[PDB]
Chain A
Amino acid sequence: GVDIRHNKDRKVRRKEPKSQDIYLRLLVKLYRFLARRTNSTFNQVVLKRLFMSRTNRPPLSLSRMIRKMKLPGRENKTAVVVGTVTDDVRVQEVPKLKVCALRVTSRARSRILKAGGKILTFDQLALDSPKGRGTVLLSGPRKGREVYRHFGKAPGTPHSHTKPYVRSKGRKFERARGRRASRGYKN
């Protein structure tokens, strides 16, 4: 008999991608080897992010990437994102960038290639920089999904700006009792 608790004995993190495609699994093999036979933690972070799910790999926009690479000090370094690089149409001037991503939108790829940059895939990234020196690791906005507007402190409760679940927006849908001081109460 030992006075211990087994509730949190097992950790929940992912050991391998839930996906079944073969290209991602080959990438996982390569980066598993790199992470376990290299002291650099960039490989560990990249492999962990390869394991993650789709909603945990949000797309990164061209405007975000250029904005985060225009910061001082990080010139002529390769921007690495484990998600999808999507094009942003509300930006005219695009510089030359050295991008690496699993997949890139067709229009975004056309824009970068026209601007003069080059697109890399995580394989060739391994060949170029195994330990990943000169890399700027970016990611898309994880809280960008609209489901996060429904989360948190419940609506109809003071100081809670949480979106309710309504089938249609209008004046006849959840506007009368809990939303007005004129009818009952106002939270």
Chain B
Amino acid sequence: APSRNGMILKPHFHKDWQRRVATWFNQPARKIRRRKARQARARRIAPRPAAGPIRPIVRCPTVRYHTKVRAGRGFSLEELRVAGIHKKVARTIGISVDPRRRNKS
């Protein structure tokens, strides 16, 4: 029942929410495991960059962010061809390549 004055609230606890609860007590262990895997892969690929393949310059696709510049999924075939890089050799020498991206500009 409403008290004197306050906000109308709609708590979404009308289901059996107590059976599906995600506690985060394994967060530090997860961070430690991810780190260990990261360094293990970095050691595995001996001289190669730890981050991975280089990626391209892209513009965010929205009025809210079109002023910013991201890191894209991969270089497209038009760019590879005009840069003189074969689409199959780029991946094995360290260039991320995707064929979906176009080039309007």
Q: Do chains A and B touch in the complex (CB under 8 A)?
A: yes
Contact A167 B8 (CB under 8 A): yes
Contact B5 A166 (CB under 8 A): no
The number of chain A residues touching the other chain, given as a range, is under 10
Kindly list chain B residues whose C-beta atoms are within 8 Å of the C-beta of A166: 7
Kindly list chain B residues whose C-beta atoms are within 8 Å of the C-beta of A167: 7-9
Smallest beta-carbon distance A64→chain B, Å: 32
CB-CB nearest in chain A for B10: A167
Contact A154 B9 (CB under 8 A): no
Give the A-B contact count at a CB cut-off of 8 A: 8
Within 8 A of A (CB), among B1-54: 5-9
The number of chain B residues touching the other chain, given as a range, is under 10
Q: Mark A150-164, 1 if CB is under 8 A from B, else 0.
A: 000010000000000
Interface of A: prevailing SS: loop
Is the C-beta of A165 less than 8 angstroms from some C-beta in chain B? yes
CB-CB nearest in chain B for A166: B7
Kindly list chain B residues whose C-beta atoms are within 8 Å of the C-beta of A165: 5-7
Smallest beta-carbon distance B5→chain A, Å: 7
Kindly list chain A residues whose C-beta atoms are within 8 Å of the C-beta of B6: 165
Within 8 A of A (CB), among B77-96: none
Report the Cα distance A165→B6, complex, angstroms: 6
Kindly list chain A residues whose C-beta atoms are within 8 Å of the C-beta of B5: 154, 165
Report the Cα distance A166→B5, complex, angstroms: 12
| A-B pairs with beta carbons under 8 Å apart, 8 shown | A154-B5, A165-B5, A165-B6, A165-B7, A166-B7, A167-B7, A167-B8, A167-B9
Enumerate the 8 nearest inter-chain pairs by beta-carbon distance, A residue then B residue, closest first. A165-B7, A167-B7, A165-B6, A166-B7, A165-B5, A154-B5, A167-B9, A167-B8
Which B residues have a C-beta under 8 Å from some C-beta of A?
A: 5-9
Additional 6 contacts, C-beta under 8 A, given A154-B5, A167-B8: A165-B5, A165-B6, A165-B7, A166-B7, A167-B7, A167-B9
